Symmetry: C3
Subunit: 178 residues, 3 copies
């Protein structure tokens, strides 16, 4: 069972401006675990070409938030509209793809933090060069006004000088709600 984006380069995401990016995301249910594959191409807007070195007002991090309602359907405040995730031809209800509430509990309180296990860290690379690292930080179930969430935080420390945000691929897994 697969929940996925399209695989073409057609944008499906708003980081800065409408349709400025393509998040390619493939979620494969393997029983209790979701096997996840993600990449990002930024096609337009201020993050298409990282110009941190000549624009000190440009941020060195952003989020792509997948905020799910209790049915496992994306909410309006997500970076991607709900039409852009679909099931692959057979061989709504996407609760089976949602991050497990017991493994990845919400913050209990307003003064409370999630456990670190709700997060995965990985290194990905811009423009297919190992000297352009970006930290991809993936956090489950840590967003206000949502039933479930997957948040992709992208951050970097180098003052990049006209580097296209064309990211390498990253694989990870998380424990499924059901």
């Amino acid at each position: 069972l697969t929940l996925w984006t399209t695989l073409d380069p057609s944008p499906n995401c708003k980081i800065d401006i409408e349709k400025d990016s393509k998040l390619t995301l493939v979620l494969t249910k393997c029983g209790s675990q979701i096997l996840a594959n993600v990449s990002l191409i930024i096609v337009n807007g201020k993050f298409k070409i990282l110009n941190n070195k000549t624009d000190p007002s440009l941020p060195k991090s952003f989020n792509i938030k997948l905020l799910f309602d209790q049915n496992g359907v994306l909410l309006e405040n997500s970076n991607i509209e709900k039409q852009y995730l679909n099931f692959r031809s057979g061989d709504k209800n996407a609760i089976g793809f949602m991050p497990n509430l017991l493994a990845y509990a919400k913050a209990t309180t307003d003064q409370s933090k999630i456990y670190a296990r709700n997060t995965i860290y990985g290194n990905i690379y811009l423009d297919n060069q190992p000297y352009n690292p970006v930290v991809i930080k993936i956090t489950f179930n840590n967003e206000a006004d949502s039933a479930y969430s997957i948040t992709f935080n992208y951050s970097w420390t180098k003052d990049y000088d006209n580097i296209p945000f064309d990211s390498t691929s990253f694989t990870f897994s998380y424990i499924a709600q059901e």
Copy 2:
């Protein structure tokens, strides 16, 4: 088919003192490969808060050893008792979850080493901060007085100063015995 711990924060592991830690471990059989998801929270004992900077006697590494008998059931000398791994509701014999003996051969001799392929390295992070790295080193079939083993070695180089051992999640895979 899944072999797993509970997903709650309840401790199941002894690193230093009884029940000082929760190793959350999810093993999903995907035919010839086990898809594995692991995190660690240390709740009590000397490693709950890393105080290397003010306690030079505190180690900068420890092991969590899963020593299996030839039936794929944990042995007494493991860091976790055999009750703490169970099969997930259907849709002992856990030999299907054991690390493959041909791919991950035991040391032949007393002067002999395993092949490096018996090991995976990953970086995880304490307290959900990228400046708190720990090396997670996972080795198959390298333990005395066991049929199979999975060893999780955690090590670090920074003299951490009151950092909670609350680890981010890590995904890996290994080749199954059958």
Copy 3:
């Protein structure tokens, strides 16, 4: 469904000289995604022991190329002969294991580059030591005179001084053609 090498240490690969290496590669079909496990042992030839420090003519990178024909069968110019990948006993046509053409498009032109999403980066370690890093760079569908390809580029920056090329294991996933 699994497409795999043998798991023993028997060489199956030519980097420098005939049969100088064993690439252990396990490809598990999980619906739309291939779960991949890879390791490399170099048994003979100039890369068996990295002597960069005392042989400045020795390269600090090499490729293992799996060039597939449109049937998903290895081509002669690959580093491995087509006999060395087989299906695991049931429970040619390997197009189901091929990297997806829409997700991992070929270079359009002669002046054109692939998208970065065609590549995965990982760090592996020689002789099971964390101070012997090698960058493993895996690229899909980027080779001339092939229908599909998986290229494993191994590179390093340290002038290694008699370090055996006995690599740790690495897991990754990619999107399947069908």
